[PDB]
């Protein structure tokens with residue numbers, strides 16, 4: 234009815250899985266495109282999934298020929314197959330938004346036309362040290378070396394501190410299209426989850442995030458020690474970046490806070506984002522519930538995106554050992570107020586996002602205290 | 615690891631479903647024994663499930679054979695069948711405790727040995743008019759005609775006896791002395807290998823004999839009554855062997871004293887609010903309890919006032935859809951549909967839990983949904 238439609242999700246990792254939990258609560262059929270038995274398929278026992286990859290032309294097209302709206306839980310999808318099937322199903326958010334967004338360098342130039350403040354950069358026309366060395370004397374060291382495509386979870390980033398790191402950097406991001414970014418000296422990082430609807434623009438509070446080795450680690454929601462003046466500029470900034478893109482759906486906005494208190498965009502995501510996991514226990518409508526509603530033109534009471542109590546989300550990243558992530562979840566079993574989410578991801582690879590723990594509390598202070606020991610254990614591994 | 619043990623659950627209705635939701639978060643495998651595509655199995659795509667009824671000796675024996683522990687999501691389960699296998703698989707909570715509980719008369723007699731304040735009652739051996747009549751004289755009217763095993767009949771005076779008896783024909787009974795409560799109460803208790811914990815006392819509301827609404831916590835009920843209820847609950851449940859979540863329904867008497875209504879040996883309707891209401895739901899709590907995992911006390915506390923509205927089948931096989939479609943627009947409304955599909959009259963189709971910082975506030979948001987459901 235309002236829930237008879239089928240939703241095609243390109244990608245079926247943890248994100249796709251949180252989306253399915255939300256789908257399941259409303260009895261909306263979610264057909265997933267990804268490997269068999271992926272995280273999302275694991276909790277949706279029916280026959281509509283499609284086996285194959287989201288960057289796969291014919292797999293992308295089959296999914297679409299069987300669903301009323303096709304969405305994505307990842308950006309590195311075949312937007313060409315999507316333009317091809319644009320006539321057979323609705324796509325939200327838009328294939329052009331995804332195509333743009335999926336190339337970081339391209340995303341950025343798209344936004345610069347829009348006024349968006351963002352770190353200086355230089356594309357790398359070949360992958361020579363000569364080239365890099367050059368760009369180095371153009372924007373200084375260190376600098377962030379980055380792959381234009383396929384990057385997520387710090388996977389296409391490489392900090393270059395000196396000209397002596399050059400070969401390692403290049404090796405590291407071997408055979409990928411690159412660009413370098415002038416350093417961003419942030420006093421903190423922020424993120425706003427924006428929701429684009431048929432007739433409205435909604436958003437959650439600004440949160441403070443902490444990244445290490447280029448990967449998100451913690452999220453404090455709402456953001457600590459930030460004036461309502463900053464929260465605000467942050468929010469405007471985020472809505473602006475989003476308005477630059479076509480589509481209904483949840484959008485993730487990453488910004489850096491300058492020592493000067495001014496704001497910079499770090500990157501924009503045309504999907505459900507790690508920065509918003511706290512919404513599950515943190516608000517009445519999680520980002521995941523929100524996103525389905527948006528792409529299905531279902532209501533979204535704004536009150537439901539307000540934060541119920543303070544919270545902190547800690548990621549459970551693969552460590553040196555492959556058992557290691559379990560030890561963290563295990564410790565979480567004893568943190569008061571800690572909600573544990575394991576991704577059913579398989580082999581835990583170092584740096585691999587394997588699950589998250591979200592801790593709430595009537596006050597940050599107290600949420601901070603409940604979680605310390607778990608960060609402590611997490612830290613020593 | 616700590617989450618490599620297998621859980622087999624008898625039943626795959628909305629209860630097993632939420633129980634499955636919780637294990638999927640922990641990636642703990644659940645083999646459900648029930649029909650195919652049961653609400654629960656649909657959210658658990660693996661091959662360990664068993665197709666059958668939890669009333670058939672063999673379906674059951676098959677499930678134990680593939681689990682570490684066996685638990686249940688419905689009370690009417692075969693406990694002799696379960697008994698048989700307590701040799702091959704651990705059963706939590708006890709088949710004995712289950713067996714005792716699923717008979718309300720026996721459940722009742724075990725609990726008097728323990729001091730559980732309850733209604734006086736009288737066992738009907740004959741299901742004869744003359745026998746009932748006598749009882750009535752000791753107990754007074756009206757009184758509650760009850761089956762030990764929809765199964766109740768309020769009897770007002772001598773004359774209703776007749777109607778009252780066919781009314782509960784086939785079944786054996788005992789009648790209960792009237793309870794003049796001013797409110798109904800419920801406590802979700804958690805029996806751990808080591809302790810008996812409870813979540814807060816909540817107020818429950820019925821309609822046509824089916825839970826309709828629950829107010830968490832119970833409205834304008836002093837802190838003392840709350841704790842008294844919690845105490846009584848914990849104490850009755852401690853009279854049982856085995857681990858796991860137990861739901862205890864109580865009567866608040868006019869004099870503010872508490873009387874036990876009944877105990878259910880499992881995750882129970884009155885506790886659904888614990889999903890959005892507490893850091894650890896009753897589903898989360900059960901899985902931990904049975905598997906011996908920590909259960910931090912604070913995680914059992916109510917984060918904010920919440921109200922759960924059950925979504926009950928009406929006359930139309932779609933109506934639940936109205937309720938939920940109306941709820942899409944209710945502020946702070948967390949919707950739970952059971953994928954039971956086919957709406958029949960009075961069937962439990964889903965539930966909605968609405969939260970807010972204050973109970974008054976939640977009542978305000980949910981009102982219209984109530985009217986809605988009421989309109990139909």
Ligand SMILES: Nc1ncnc2c1ncn2[C@@H]1O[C@H](COP(=O)(O)OP(=O)(O)O)[C@@H](O)[C@H]1O
Pocket residue numbers: 352377384385386387388389390414415416417418422444445446447448487499500
């Ligand atoms: N210019 C930069 N200067 C300093 N640190 C950066 C810069 N760009 C990225 N980072 C750091 O790495 C994190 C992840 O980088 P990002 O560009 O967001 O890639 P990913 O797609 O893999 O998220 C950022 O949150 C920030 O900590």
Ligand SMILES: Nc1ncnc2c1ncn2[C@@H]1O[C@H](COP(=O)(O)OP(=O)(O)O)[C@@H](O)[C@H]1O
Pocket residue numbers: 733758764765766790791792793794798863875876
């Ligand atoms: N002794 C009693 N006097 C008044 N009402 C009673 C009595 N016993 C049961 N009831 C009412 O009947 C409803 C169902 O009774 P209960 O013993 O819980 O039966 P069931 O297991 O069938 O729900 C109760 O929740 C309460 O309203």
Ligand SMILES: Nc1cncn1[C@@H]1O[C@H](COP(=O)(O)O)[C@@H](O)[C@H]1O
Pocket residue numbers: 244245246247248249250306307308385386585586
């Ligand atoms: N982190 C991220 C960025 N873009 C998508 N994801 C999530 O990460 C997945 C899987 O990452 P992994 O490479 O560890 O399997 C995606 O499908 C989605 O759920």
Ligand SMILES: Nc1cncn1[C@@H]1O[C@H](COP(=O)(O)O)[C@@H](O)[C@H]1O
Pocket residue numbers: 625626627628629630687688689954961962
């Ligand atoms: N109503 C109830 C009573 N005891 C448990 N349940 C739940 O009801 C389900 C089945 O309800 P139905 O008869 O409508 O199919 C059971 O599996 C369990 O979840």
Ligand SMILES: [Mg+2]
Pocket residue numbers: 487499500
């Ligand atoms: Mg990022």
Ligand SMILES: [Mg+2]
Pocket residue numbers: 863876
């Ligand atoms: Mg009852």
Ligand code: NA
Pocket residue numbers: 443444445446
């Ligand atoms: Na950092």
